């Protein structure tokens, strides 16, 4: 958000936000799908890797390109710059690619069901299927996995180049005024380290937060539309939306409760680092002078460091117990809710696997948020360091 | 392997190895199991968590205690010490606990079969099953998981205390000779850091290597005895031990190729480090002088660091491609070997799952060793540093 890269620190981000909101609530809720009525959009979506060319996707590609083009051209004409190409279009492209990868994941999860239904048919009645059908299924799976691989690799390449461009832009800006910044202590290590640290950390946090929100908004409606086959839960009885509540409560309770029960550790780590540093400094003074380090004082300092380690070694047990117990029960909790439905003859082998996979992905989407917060505090420290060290 | 903790780096270790060899080739190949003939050993093993009190395990516990007792007491009498109790018995206990946890894993993998046979019967013919059987199966699984959790937590606690005792022992030994070691440059950082680094690194690599070998030696016979139901492979045809050969080849190829295709990276990391250090040093010189920092020289330094990062960014794509491709193919490869047998109706759902899980665990037992190597490199650097800095 500096002045050199990213055309302005003010109106730019606000304008981007407002225009994003206008576009989103013109498409989804306002019903832009009427555009699909002008074209011949059928509305049915295949399962193969031919999904990504049907008009229902191609209209969306056109809409995204049109919106981003208009927005970027406005700024290109209103207030020129030097890194406009990277700062606008690289960010738009990274957002798009994250969405695309989420969609590929959705496609594979949708593929799991026919395969296992076919396996069940094969096992129950040995005269009904041959091997060519299994070969066909493997073929379509490879068809999807290919594009997943290609997009992932190219995305990594482009992200790395973009981050280095941010670093070079603001290093150039700082060195443009080196003479007035000579005297302030720690200018060298600042200019050499904090620039890369800030750029990389902020990019990583932004991408992870966006991806978490996208995964949730893509995968909860599948749980809603699949919760029609599980009317009764083993202990509760009858709830309209038992599956959704159970998944949310289980994943939330796991991640949030483990985060809360292990909140007190970092302070203990501060204490350990401080006492060790005191030991080191006292030894450094003792190195050259023959009256500094005497067995009394070194004994006292080592007693302090030992006593401050044992506290951490004892508090770690709550966290260990909670983590291991949750990890062990998770292997069968997702399967525990589906006994009455299997007996009652509603879900086949192939709607067990989709349900397990969706549980897993919704659980994993509640993990990026605590990564985002953990990265955010780190980013705050460096932000204040780069702000104070500027006049 | 110092002189303070672990009495000697010579005869002690060699004696330990020789006694281990005698004990092992008296038990396995020489058949000490005839003690089971003296006692009323059943010879059969349950499936529940009631396994770990059966005579077959209790005899082994007695034998291990007796062997360790003889070995330890000979050294207690022959050549006394100060930390003998930790140095002998802590290591013996850590080895035993690692083996125990491997056995717990084997028990769970064996439990996976009856459960999925029951689920298949519930899906096919629902008049043969009732829900109480599902509840009983979940009960026995919890019965195993409980002891797994308890042993794991206690083991982590003991390992941490053992490492800290090693550190305090050699710290005390060094500080006994502080007066004569003052002049050697960089003594404070040595005494304050290398002790913890060396102890922790060596212990971690030893534990991981032992655990990998134990997993292989426990999980290969299961594949040998389970490959009797899979006579024909999809392309090869008929081969006496097709499953074992295919599993070994796939896992070894995966891990070894991923390792070899990416051997060049650390050198590039070092080059980047050195160029950045040069840039930092030049800026530090030019800070308080009005001539050292000049646009041409700093421009040259930055050009070097840019041109040298771009090479790593270009090379890393091959590693990305290999990694992602293997990670995506492994999803369905494990099930690709079982198509003719599923079709012909030989294996039931419940031996598909055992086989898949065994594939996963043998693949995960080829990943410890590659980490052991990387830990060994770090160990050796610190070893040479701490051996040069002793007269």
């Amino acid at each position, epitope marked *: 958000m500096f002045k050199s890269f990213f055309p302005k620190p003010g109106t730019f981000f606000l304008s981007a936000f407002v225009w994003a909101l206008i576009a989103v609530i013109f498409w989804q809720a306002g019903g832009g799908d009427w555009v699909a009525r002008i074209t011949g959009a059928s509305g049915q979506i295949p399962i193969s890797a031919a999904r990504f060319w049907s008009l229902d996707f191609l209209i969306f590609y056109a809409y995204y390109i049109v919106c981003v083009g208009l927005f970027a051209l406005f700024w290109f004409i209103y207030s020129p710059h030097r890194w406009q190409y990277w700062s606008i279009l690289g960010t738009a492209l990274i957002i798009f690619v994250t969405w695309f990868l989420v969609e590929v994941g959705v496609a594979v999860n949708a593929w799991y069901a026919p395969f296992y239904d076919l396996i069940q048919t094969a096992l129950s009645s040995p005269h009904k299927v041959t091997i060519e059908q299994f070969y066909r299924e493997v073929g379509v799976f490879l068809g999807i996995a290919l594009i997943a691989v290609v997009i992932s690799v190219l995305n990594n390449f482009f992200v790395s180049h973009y981050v280095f461009r941010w670093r070079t832009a603001m290093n150039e800006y700082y060195m443009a005024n080196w003479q007035q910044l000579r005297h302030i202590e720690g200018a060298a290590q600042r200019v050499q380290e904090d620039t890369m640290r800030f750029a990389s950390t902020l990019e990583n946090m932004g991408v992870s937060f966006i991806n978490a929100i996208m995964t949730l908004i893509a995968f909860l409606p599948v749980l809603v539309t699949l919760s029609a086959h599980v009317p009764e839960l083993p202990i509760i009885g009858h709830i309209p939306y038992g599956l959704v509540i159970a998944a949310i409560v289980w994943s939330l309770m796991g991640t949030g409760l483990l985060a809360v029960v292990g909140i007190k550790l970092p302070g203990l780590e501060f204490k350990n680092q401080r006492v060790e540093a005191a030991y080191r400094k006292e030894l450094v003074y003792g190195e050259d002078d023959a009256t500094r380090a005497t067995p009394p004082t070194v004994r006292e300092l080592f007693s302090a460091v030992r006593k401050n380690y044992f506290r951490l070694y004892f508090h770690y047990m709550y966290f260990n117990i909670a983590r291991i117990l949750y990890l062990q029960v998770d292997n069968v909790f997702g399967l525990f809710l589906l006994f009455p439905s299997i007996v*009652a*003859g509603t879900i*086949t082998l192939g709607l067990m696997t989709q349900i397990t996979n969706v549980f897993g992905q919704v659980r994993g989407a509640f993990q990026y948020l605590i990564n985002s917060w953990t990265t955010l505090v780190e980013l705050m420290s460096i932000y204040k360091r780069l702000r104070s060290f500027e006049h | 392997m110092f002189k303070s903790f672990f009495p000697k780096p010579g005869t002690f270790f060699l004696s330990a190895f020789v006694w281990a060899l005698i004990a092992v080739i008296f038990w396995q190949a020489g058949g000490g199991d005839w003690v089971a003939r003296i006692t009323g050993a059943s010879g059969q093993i349950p499936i529940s968590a009631a396994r770990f009190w059966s005579l077959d395990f209790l005899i082994f516990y007695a034998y291990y205690i007796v062997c360790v007792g003889l070995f330890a007491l000979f050294w207690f009498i022959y050549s006394p010490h100060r930390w003998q109790y930790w140095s002998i018995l802590g290591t013996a206990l850590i080895i035993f606990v690692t083996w125990f946890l491997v056995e717990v894993g084997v028990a769970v993998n064996a439990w996976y079969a009856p459960f999925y046979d029951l689920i298949q019967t519930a899906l096919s*013919s*629902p*008049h043969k099953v009732t829900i109480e059987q599902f509840y009983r199966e979940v009960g026995v699984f919890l019965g195993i998981a409980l002891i797994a959790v308890v042993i794991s937590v206690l083991n982590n606690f003991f390992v941490s205390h053992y490492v800290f005792r090693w550190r305090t022992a050699m710290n005390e030994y060094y500080m006994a000779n502080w007066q004569q070691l003052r002049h050697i440059e960089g003594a404070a950082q040595r005494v304050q850091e290398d002790t913890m680094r060396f102890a922790s690194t060596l212990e971690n690599m030893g534990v991981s290597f032992i655990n990998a070998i134990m997993t292989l030696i426990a999980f290969l016979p299961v594949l040998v005895t389970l490959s009797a139901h899979v006579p024909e492979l999809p392309i090869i045809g008929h081969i006496p031990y097709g499953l074992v050969i295919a599993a070994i080849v796939w896992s070894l190829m995966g891990t070894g190729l991923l390792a070899v295709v990416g051997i060049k990276l650390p050198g590039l990391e070092f080059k980047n480090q050195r160029v950045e250090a040069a840039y930092r040093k030049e800026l530090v010189y030019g800070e308080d002088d009005a001539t050292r920092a000049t646009p041409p020289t700093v421009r040259e330094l930055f050009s070097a660091v840019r041109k040298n990062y771009f090479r790593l960014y270009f090379h890393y794509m091959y590693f990305n491609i290999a990694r992602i491709l293997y990670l995506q193919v492994d999803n369905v490869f494990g099930l690709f070997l079982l198509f003719p047998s599923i079709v012909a109706g030989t294996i039931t759902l419940g031996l598909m799952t055992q086989i898949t899980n065994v594939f996963g665990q043998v693949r995960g037992a080829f990943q410890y060793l590659i980490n052991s190597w990387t830990t060994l490199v770090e160990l050796m650097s610190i070893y040479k540093r701490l051996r040069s800095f002793e007269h």
Partner: antibody, heavy 120, light 107 residues
Framework: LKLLDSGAELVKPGASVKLSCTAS????????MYWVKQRPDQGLEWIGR????????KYDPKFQGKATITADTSSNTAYLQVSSLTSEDTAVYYC??????????????WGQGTSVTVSS | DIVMTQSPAILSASPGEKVTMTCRAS?????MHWYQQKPGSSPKPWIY???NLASGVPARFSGSGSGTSYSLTISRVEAEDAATYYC?????????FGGGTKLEIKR
């Protein structure tokens, strides 16, 4: 419980015929509904069954391709169709219900039978 | 197919005596049920899973056996037990009946 079958039927060699069995007093989502055939030699022969909740049906291999069993989950009813009738298909056909989920009471209840006379 | 043989194929008794019939399988089942068909009427279970007497039937019927050997026992026959008895196995997806043992009453 009650099961009502159709009436007696007379057919010409070559025609196909459909028989119905309607269930009043319970919910056919909780049971099986199989069909049994008894020739004039009183020995009993098993034809096939169906699971109305999802639709899986199973047949004796000898009768495969000769009979088709279906269920109407909306209004309690089950149907069986016989094709290519010959002179060896004169018998009596009984429907039945077997409790799988909801187990209490008598676990097997039989209908009454519909004679199917094939003649010219 | 699991072929099931029932003996004796024709029987007799008198009011007050005890009667047994045997229905021997051809492999392990664990799933045996016993029926009765009077003249001109549909069948009716007595014994479900070889021991569990179903809803109210006179307490003089009793079944026993396990593995591949099963017996039906009637304690004190009456004039109202002249019928034909079958035995059904259940543990496959062909299901095979028995041969039936016409019972008579002496007088």
């Amino acid at each position: 419980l009650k099961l009502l079958d159709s009436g007696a039927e007379l057919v010409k060699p070559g025609a196909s015929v459909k028989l119905s069995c309607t269930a009043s007093g319970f919910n056919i989502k909780d049971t099986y509904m199989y069909w049994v055939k008894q020739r004039p030699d009183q020995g009993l022969e098993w034809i096939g069954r169906i699971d109305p909740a999802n639709g899986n049906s199973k047949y004796d291999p000898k009768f495969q391709g000769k009979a088709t069993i279906t269920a109407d989950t909306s209004s309690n009813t089950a149907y069986l169709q016989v094709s290519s009738l010959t002179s060896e298909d004169t018998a009596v056909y009984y429907c039945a219900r077997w409790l799988v989920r909801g187990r209490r009471g008598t676990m097997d209840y039989w209908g009454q039978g519909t004679s199917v006379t094939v003649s010219s | 197919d699991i072929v099931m043989t029932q003996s004796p194929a024709i029987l007799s008794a008198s009011p007050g005596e005890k009667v047994t019939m045997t229905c021997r399988a051809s492999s392990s089942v664990s799933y045996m049920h016993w029926y009765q068909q009077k003249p001109g009427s549909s069948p009716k279970p007595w014994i479900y899973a070889t021991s569990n007497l179903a809803s109210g039937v006179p307490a003089r019927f009793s079944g026993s056996g396990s593995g591949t050997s099963y017996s039906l026992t009637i304690s004190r026959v009456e004039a109202e037990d002249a019928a034909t008895y079958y035995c059904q196995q259940w543990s496959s997806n062909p299901r095979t009946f028995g041969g039936g043992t016409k019972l008579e009453i002496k007088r």
